[PDB]
Ligand binder design. Sequence first.
Ligand SMILES: [K+]
Ligand SMILES: [K+]
Ligand SMILES: [K+]
Ligand SMILES: [K+]
Ligand SMILES: [K+]
Ligand SMILES: [K+]
Ligand SMILES: [Mg+2]
Ligand SMILES: [Mg+2]
Ligand SMILES: [Mg+2]
Ligand SMILES: [Mg+2]
Ligand SMILES: [Mg+2]
Ligand SMILES: [Mg+2]
Length: 115
Amino acid sequence: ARIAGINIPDHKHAVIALTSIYGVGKTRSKAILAAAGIAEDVKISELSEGQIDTLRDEVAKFVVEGDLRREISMSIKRLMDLGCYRGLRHRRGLPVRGQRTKTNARTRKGPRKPI
RNA sequence: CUCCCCGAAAGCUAUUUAGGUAGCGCCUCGUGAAUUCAUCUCCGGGGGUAGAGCACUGUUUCGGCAAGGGGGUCAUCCCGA
Ligand SMILES: [K+]
Ligand SMILES: [K+]
Ligand SMILES: [K+]
Ligand SMILES: [K+]
Ligand SMILES: [K+]
Ligand SMILES: [K+]
Ligand SMILES: [Mg+2]
Ligand SMILES: [Mg+2]
Ligand SMILES: [Mg+2]
Ligand SMILES: [Mg+2]
Ligand SMILES: [Mg+2]
Ligand SMILES: [Mg+2]
């Protein structure tokens, strides 16, 4: 119950439990169990250590966790120092994908700030 | 009424005490006991004043160095220069 440096739940199906890894969604979690030869509905509790290791190498094929967290942070970093319009939206906390800001946009702005 | 000898104090402590009083200090008279007491010289002592000084406690002026702080020029998301 220790993959990619983190601990994954033991009472959950293998397909659901693997999604606890930053960088592995339901699709990738479905591919890994396929690449290892394990069913999806099997709890990782009753998984032999001879099987967990066969999952760890497959997870190594993907850029997950801190390496992904550094790639995403670098991508944003590249826009912000560039001065491009997208990086200016990241600077000012506004939405970047051309959404309306007259109303809404509270996910990027946060809760309301009275005058 | 007279003569002879010595000769103060106006301090301390306490006091419904403060211009009163009490004990002590200072005056007198008597008795007793030590080279007892004083001056000077030499010897043994502690000292924290005068003066001086500025390590300490504070205060003070000038210069040097400078953490830092602030005021600005950009930068500005974080940086920062
Ligand atoms: K818009
Ligand atoms: K008296
Ligand atoms: K007497
Ligand atoms: K004599
Ligand atoms: K002497
Ligand atoms: K001094
Ligand atoms: Mg999806
Ligand atoms: Mg639109
Ligand atoms: Mg006389
Ligand atoms: Mg009384
Ligand atoms: Mg009276
Ligand atoms: Mg003096």
